[PDB]
Design a protein around this ligand. Structure first.
Ligand SMILES: [Mg+2]
Ligand SMILES: [Mg+2]
Ligand SMILES: [Mg+2]
Ligand SMILES: [Mg+2]
Ligand SMILES: [Mg+2]
Ligand SMILES: [Mg+2]
Ligand SMILES: [Mg+2]
Ligand SMILES: [Mg+2]
Ligand SMILES: [Mg+2]
Ligand SMILES: [Mg+2]
Ligand SMILES: [Mg+2]
Ligand SMILES: [Mg+2]
Ligand SMILES: [Mg+2]
Ligand SMILES: [Mg+2]
Ligand SMILES: [Mg+2]
Ligand SMILES: [Mg+2]
Ligand SMILES: [Mg+2]
Ligand SMILES: [Mg+2]
Ligand SMILES: [Mg+2]
Ligand SMILES: [Mg+2]
Length: 49
RNA sequence: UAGCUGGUUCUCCCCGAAAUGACUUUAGGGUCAGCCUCAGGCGCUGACUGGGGCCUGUAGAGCACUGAUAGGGCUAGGGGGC
């Protein structure tokens, strides 16, 4: 048993999502596509309306 | 700082919206609900349909109520004439 194949067993999918591309999450990048979508939104937790 | 404008880069596969309601110094922004999706759980219930019961005041019609209305009759009131 050696370093060739001691790999992460059948999980731990370190693959984050990349929303810059021409397919999948794209252009608008992730759930956006409108406005007040830029630096941040006010909360909600407590804050808002 | 910018609740505004612009821009956001490889591939294939499955599903697939909304542009409504409530509140908002709210109205091209938001929070909750509605609608989308994924995971786990329940498992014949779901849309649609057959049979039966109850709830209803629209279309149409009607003048019994509330009002409107043409002609005639009968008839207080008022008007003209003896
Ligand atoms: Mg990346
Ligand atoms: Mg990128
Ligand atoms: Mg994807
Ligand atoms: Mg997409
Ligand atoms: Mg815009
Ligand atoms: Mg818009
Ligand atoms: Mg901001
Ligand atoms: Mg799918
Ligand atoms: Mg389809
Ligand atoms: Mg109210
Ligand atoms: Mg605004
Ligand atoms: Mg919401
Ligand atoms: Mg069934
Ligand atoms: Mg009736
Ligand atoms: Mg009618
Ligand atoms: Mg009668
Ligand atoms: Mg009457
Ligand atoms: Mg009365
Ligand atoms: Mg008479
Ligand atoms: Mg008289």
């Amino acid at each position: 048993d050696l370093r060739p194949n001691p790999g992460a067993n059948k999980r731990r999918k370190r693959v984050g999502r990349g929303p810059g591309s021409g397919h999948g999450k794209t252009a608008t990048r992730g759930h956006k596509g409108q406005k007040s979508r830029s630096g941040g939104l006010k909360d909600p937790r407590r804050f808002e309306g």
